[PDB]
Design a protein around this nucleic acid. Structure first.
Lengths: 318, 314
DNA sequence: TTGTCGGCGATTCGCCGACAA
DNA sequence: TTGTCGGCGAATCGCCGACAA
């Protein structure tokens, strides 16, 4: 599976740690992930696993995948607890889908800025200028597309293969579609759906903790699943970062920034102020750095509301 | 909450224990369920049968895929009508045609229709498992006389995401209220892991059972009957009647596989052995080796449990 | 720049007998 | 009995400007 397509499909400004490197595994966040998939009806009556709130581990492997039907991405990781002790970027673009794009009656309207950035630079006055587009999704499938240039005024459009793309992939409005350009000119297509069993909530909610506890008293390797669309904050982060944050002193009234949204012309700076500092869930996880920062956003607009944050998630601001 | 549809949708010849009754919780078989979705040093000394109270059953279904499942609540004990199915033909699933109904199904369960009127037809509104209404036009035409579903068949086929090889189901019952169901054919690509890795389920299962048994506190679990080989929560009566029983080798037996005719295959007992002695010593789980006389579709379910089999006469 | 809508095709869909399996 | 197919109507699908935001 392609690195670049899997990352863009997952999340913007979302990256994983390097394999072979030491990383902080944070049980509290894995738990949050598991409570995301199926709304956790109760977390009560779980045996007391005196487990550190951060577990430093060797990262032994990353295995990225994708469901063949719904194209939902996830990765399989192999952590090993430890005894006490840039790159490249390819032209891409993303767009969230309007009901016109989804409507069967219509095709799809491409952004002006996006044709320029990544799509194949096209011919003069073909009356109406067009070129065949070959795309691969995350399974190597080819979806062919007619990218014609028309309307009055002129816009960039997709017609042939757009409609079949939307039924086969079961897309709707609010959703988003993706493209990458490689050196080869081979453009790739991806799908990031808008937000909407085998085991119970308590059985997962304890199998997580049981596994880690065993793999930590044993210093034996164990596995876990990263499902980035279903994950609020990353829970496997470079062991370096963690230590830099713990050591760093935030004090109240300090202002901060956060780098969630990137990859658009306007970075859209996110910002807020530090109201307080507390062990977030003192009951099971005392003394942790997990979501230990109380923050108040600068006039938030019914989006991205999460009042509590962790010290490696924020940059001291202005 | 409408049992009759869920069991027919679940599996032929499948019924659950009564709520409030004592049942054998058999972790080895629960392990197998979770191991069924995805092909797999945990150390949990757990009895191979844990006798339990059944405290509640909640039947459910994914509204998207119509996959059925049940959530059960066990508590350990210290103390010592008118139905029919068809697997969907490519004519049914194709957009060109509607659905060609078996003639015997029309007579058996469907509302008898007036043949006085030259194109005998009738509006049929059916309920699936989520309360949704599906309308259907059930016409009687062709040459020779056939029962067909025409208008609305296409929308049912796309919305419920049906293909050939799948099956459809319909029920009458006493209330005359018609219910519709879908038992999709098994695919192997659809079962894939997405919330937790297999060792973490494989030990969350044992962790849960292990704690709730030393404590005698309630615990919950999930039955996914379509993806389940043999049940792992069965009447404590059945377990104890088989355990006490002496099966000996060379004995003949019968067993209730799937299929309307409820046909059962037969065979002889090859041997009797602790199936997995290392992880589960002395257990009766699949402890019988049997060799089918009808090694037909070579299902090779050669190791089975003593309460799954009836000594085979008549 | 880029959504939505009416308008009019070429193309499906979808109801109908035939026909044997 | 019931699966498929040729066939012909008829209701979409899908492409094209207009028009404003």
């Amino acid at each position: 599976i392609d690195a670049e397509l899997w990352y863009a499909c997952a999340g913007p400004q979302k990256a994983l740690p390097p394999v072979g490197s030491v990383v902080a595994y944070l049980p509290q966040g894995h738990i949050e992930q598991v409570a995301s998939f199926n709304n956790q009806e109760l977390d009560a009556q779980i045996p007391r696993y005196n487990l550190p709130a951060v577990i430093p581990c060797m990262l032994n492997d990353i295995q990225l995948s994708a469901d063949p039907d719904s194209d939902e991405v996830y990765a399989t990781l192999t952590l090993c607890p430890m005894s006490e002790q840039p790159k490249r970027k390819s032209r891409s673009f993303t767009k969230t889908l309007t009901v016109s794009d989804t409507s069967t009656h219509g095709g799809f309207s491409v952004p002006r800025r996006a044709a320029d950035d990544c799509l194949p630079k096209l011919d003069m006055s073909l009356n109406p200028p067009n070129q065949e587009l070959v795309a691969k999704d995350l399974h190597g499938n080819e979806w062919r597309f007619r990218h014609i240039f028309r309307g009055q005024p002129k816009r960039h459009l997709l017609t042939t293969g757009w409609s079949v793309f939307v039924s086969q992939k079961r897309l709707v409005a609010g959703d988003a579609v993706l493209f990458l350009r490689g050196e080869n000119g081979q453009l790739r297509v991806g799908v990031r759906r808008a937000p909407r069993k085998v085991l119970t909530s308590p059985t997962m909610h304890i199998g997580v903790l049981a596994a880690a506890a065993h793999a930590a008293t044993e210093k034996s390797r164990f596995s876990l699943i990263y499902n980035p669309r279903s994950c609020p904050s990353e829970f496997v982060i470079p062991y370096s970062k963690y230590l830099k944050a713990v050591k760093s002193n935030f004090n109240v009234g300090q202002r901060f920034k956060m780098k969630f949204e990137s990859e658009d012309p306007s970075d859209r700076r996110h910002t807020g102020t530090i109201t307080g500092i507390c062990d977030f869930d003192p009951a099971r996880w005392p003394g942790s750095e997990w979501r230990s920062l109380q923050v108040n956003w600068d006039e938030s607009s019914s989006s991205e509301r999460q009042e509590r944050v962790s010290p490696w998630e924020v940059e001291p601001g202005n």
